[PDB]
Design a protein around this ligand. Sequence first.
Ligand SMILES: C[C@@H]1O[C@H](OP(=O)(O)OP(=O)(O)OC[C@H]2O[C@@H](n3ccc(=O)[nH]c3=O)[C@H](O)[C@@H]2O)[C@H](O)[C@H](O)[C@H]1O
Length: 415
Amino acid sequence: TTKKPHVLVIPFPQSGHMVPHLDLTHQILLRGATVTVLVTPKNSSYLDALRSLHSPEHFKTLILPFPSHPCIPSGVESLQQLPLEAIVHMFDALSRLHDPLVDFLSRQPPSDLPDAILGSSFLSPWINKVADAFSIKSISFLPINAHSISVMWAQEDRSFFNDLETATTESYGLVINSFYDLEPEFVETVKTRFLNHHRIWTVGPLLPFKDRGGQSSIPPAKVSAWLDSCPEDNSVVYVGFGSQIRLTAEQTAALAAALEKSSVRFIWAVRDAAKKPAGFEERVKEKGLVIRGWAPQTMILEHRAVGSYLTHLGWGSVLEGMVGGVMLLAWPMQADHFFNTTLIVDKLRAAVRVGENRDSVPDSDKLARILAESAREDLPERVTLMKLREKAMEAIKEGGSSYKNLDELVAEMCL
Ligand SMILES: C[C@@H]1O[C@H](OP(=O)(O)OP(=O)(O)OC[C@H]2O[C@@H](n3ccc(=O)[nH]c3=O)[C@H](O)[C@@H]2O)[C@H](O)[C@H](O)[C@H]1O
């Protein structure tokens, strides 16, 4: 027969990581693999959708209690509810899942041991140590692209990413969610300088099965019949900074001001904070919608009359926006956002920058016009992205770099 692997998938508890890592899980599942996903109890919900699409004989779940940590609020097991800077304790806590794992693996029949660990590069320090102790390959996953990795791995003071970055190099291979064509210069730069076994797979855009992680807040059918009933096929601008960002009130008043002034129709996705409003306008400006909480981002970005997306330029959002066929309006604020701006905005001329810093407040008047003119397909920033979508969308069709790379990956997992 054509032997397929048993993969022990270990995502990182955070939307940017968890969401594509399951998309990557479903992709290797489809190549006839067998997966065991390891999550803490509050994170078992994100596997439901994935479970309804595979046999209990091909898809397995290991659940371990979240190791408690003094700096993390009780009952929180996912970083998206926390300040991105809190990630430093999330690393610490999760690293104590090392011992429960070894007991599970040691008491597992010699047969059923996984062929490979497809874990988060953020957990690679201890996942590698577990991987070595059973002679299992530790392939690393990252939601960011080869460009960001090169800038980041090469830092002198890394700082607290050091151990995970250098442990990622000591891995078997690396899987990242972009494509070769997008950044060939850097895929090679990572493959030779920063991968001691010189194996990297580009498998993106990882687009989703069947929704995504996890449940929106205004019901998506109320959303979809807001869209079908707005007039022109490319004239709604969706505003959302993903899951990790929440903006200060001064900027909200400025961002809301541009929207009132811009005369364009829009959806705005505001989020929550945890540690343990604009003023009046929700019904002053129809249309129109203000989804608080968590929103149907991909249903919105692929809807017909959504032509512009104002974002932090997170990498998942870059790929969601690109697939969606929508102009990117970039406002970097932290994390890989600037490296994304250097590549997409500066280098490839595929997004218009509309904000500068984590602290910026924009000219209410300037932002309103960039917002009005942003949806029209003429702009050389939109078409350069519509070209890239052409390259991305066919790099994931059969014979594409990413279709092949996933094949070659599932295979090499068995060796
Ligand atoms: C580069 C990565 O950026 C990250 O932040 P974030 O979660 O925004 O990542 P995205 O790439 O935007 O993707 C996150 C995913 O949340 C989705 N979403 C969000 C809000 C909502 O209301 N509805 C949704 O569907 C969105 O569609 C996306 O799936 C992290 O700093 C990470 O460390 C970094 O490497």
